């Protein structure tokens, strides 16, 4: 019932296309063509899945709060959706765009085919793409800090539905709130740090990703900043982030999270960027966010009913 | 009796291309010793990745220009045909001769990137000044971004790829290879609207199945007519390992690379494509532009370790 980037795990490739919609609010012919291109996307996902099951292909189209009432008069706007630019007073790099296309695959050739076919369908007359990122998994699923990324991601369809998708029975059920944020790593500053400093920074051991006990790591360790609870309930999220970039140039982490509630993501951002106790995440000494956007990925049904 | 491991294998899904200049000076014997230690580490890490990830079909080569040859070795004789590609600048655009090429191929990006990253960390910025890093990837049906299949007439199998790709046994520098790299930027806004008949006239094969257009029905300036060359009844075949690269919404094209037993096999095709043989240019050059270019020699594994 959901679009197909939230529940599956361990993709090897991801393509991220973020940009703005060029169709105006009352161009009904252009908006009909735009929705025909959305339909073609969902059909091509199915066709690639049938021909290349080994790809474990997945894809989602997601919309910002600012563009919501341009693309639909029928579906109610998700209750928590807002522009990420409202965080610009404390979080650098915000760059809210209208549209996200996120495609995942275990093969680059099918990842790229769907991304390219989709962009050719929409065309430069409908989409103004501001960012295109080719993410790829590294050996042992390590981020470029060379720590394993993903250890405490929720596992399995049951938990990833609970934390990644709007609950059944609620408005916009089986959609997801989405946050994207491109980080540029400063590995020249990170590599010389002793293992003890690197593990204090993250909050887990480097070789095996064993959690360091809460009382033995700083409260500004990354795990202490992001493992948060409210009213005895964990504010978990579903991350699909991947490394990207050039060995001899700019590189980092293309962060993306899917969540049942935007609050689960935003409270972690308040924590990491010093807005809850005046202290920043230790990881931010070594990496910098340079883009940012909030979106909502509708359910498959609402995507086709816009 | 072993070549470096990027010439003979076929159908890689990923390739990383690192091209740049050597910062070690001819007299710096301690620096050259460390440079050669890092070369040995590259050959050892290739073996280790092959052991741990046989599914990657990993391959790698380090290749040297004629300008840098006598800096890196006093012992191995310079390959007799090697020269700088900048000597072609009077007729071929985009020449940019560099000292060193590192070419890594894999069926998985994670092991491709691991070897490339580890290798660049070993050499470091104080030894290598990298001018270009390209992440190539195979597309569905092995099509170039023109959406024609690329590779139909590449030689198949170890025997023919040894014949056309490697210096012959018994010759100086046996089992090394002459190498040519050239990055192309495609003008797909210009190419996409062209009628199918124009596209097939340009390449010289059919788009759907890569069936050769009969010679009598295709232009002498078609790409296949320009590159299918012979001399004294012998075909001047080469071993291509080119891959697409780039951004859907930005700059994209083909990262061209060829390996050959003789630089002449490559250079005569360049003379053909760029108008030096008969004044006529390859039709493909109306839709794509070369923006880098370099000639190198990839030594045999033995000569690589004995520089
Ligand atoms: C440079 C950017 C980032 C890097 C390199 C990074 C890396 C990591 C690593 C290594 C872990 C530990 C392994 C794991 O459990 O996954 C982790 C955990 C986590 N990260 Fe990040 N992360 C980054 C940014 C973010 C951001 C922006 C958020 C939230 C919006 C986030 C949320 C989390 C969460 C929720 C966990 C799991 C915490 C737990 O319950 O134990 N991370 N991250
Ligand atoms: C934009 C750059 C280029 C593109 C898109 C391109 C594309 C192609 C295509 C589609 C084919 C036909 C299928 C095949 O047999 O592989 C082909 C054949 C070939 N290409 Fe290229 N090519 C390019 C540049 C070059 C260059 C620079 C050379 C030589 C240095 C070269 C040498 C060849 C050769 C030798 C063949 C096979 C000819 C035969 O014996 O039938 N190509 N190329
Ligand atoms: Na692939
Ligand atoms: Na792979
Ligand atoms: Na590239």
Numbering used by the authors:
A (entry chain A): 1 to 306
B (entry chain B): 0 to 306
Copy out sentences from the published article reporting this entry, exactly as the authors wrote them.
A novel cytoplasmic dye-decolorizing peroxidase from Dictyostelium discoideum was investigated that oxidizes anthraquinone dyes, lignin model compounds, and general peroxidase substrates such as ABTS efficiently. Dictyostelium DyPA is a dimer, with each monomer exhibiting a two-domain, α/β ferredoxin-like fold. In solution, Dictyostelium DyPA exists as a stable dimer with the side chain of Asp146 contributing to the stabilization of the dimer interface by extending the hydrogen bond network connecting two monomers. The active site of Dictyostelium DyPA has a hexa-coordinated heme iron with a histidine residue at the proximal axial position and either an activated oxygen or CN− molecule at the distal axial position.
The structure of Dictyostelium DyPA in complex with an activated form of oxygen was determined to 1.7 Å resolution. In the asymmetric unit, two molecules of Dictyostelium DyPA were found. The Fe (III) is hexa-coordinated and is in the plane of the porphyrin ring. The heme group has His222 on its proximal side, and the distal side is occupied by Asp149, Arg239, Ser241, Leu253, and Phe255. The sixth coordination position at the distal face of the heme iron is occupied by an activated oxygen molecule with elongated bond distances between the oxygen atoms of 1.7 and 2.4 Å in the two monomers. The observed distances between the coordinated oxygen atom and the heme iron in the two monomers are 2.3 and 2.6 Å. The other oxygen atom is coordinated by a hydrogen-bond network that involves Asp149, Ser241, an ethylene glycol, and water molecules. Electron density analysis revealed excess electron density on the Nδ atom of His222 imidazole, which exceeds the maximum level of electron density on the carboxyl group of Asp281 by ~1σ. This observation suggests that the imidazole ring of His222 is negatively charged in the crystal structure of the Dictyostelium DyPA:O2 complex, while the carboxyl group of Asp281 is protonated. The negative charge on His222 explains the elongated bond length in the activated O2 molecule by the decreasing effect of an additional electron on the energy difference between the highest occupied (HOMO) and lowest unoccupied (LUMO) molecular orbitals of the complex. Arg239 forms hydrogen bonds with the distally positioned heme propionate, Asp149, and the O2 molecule.
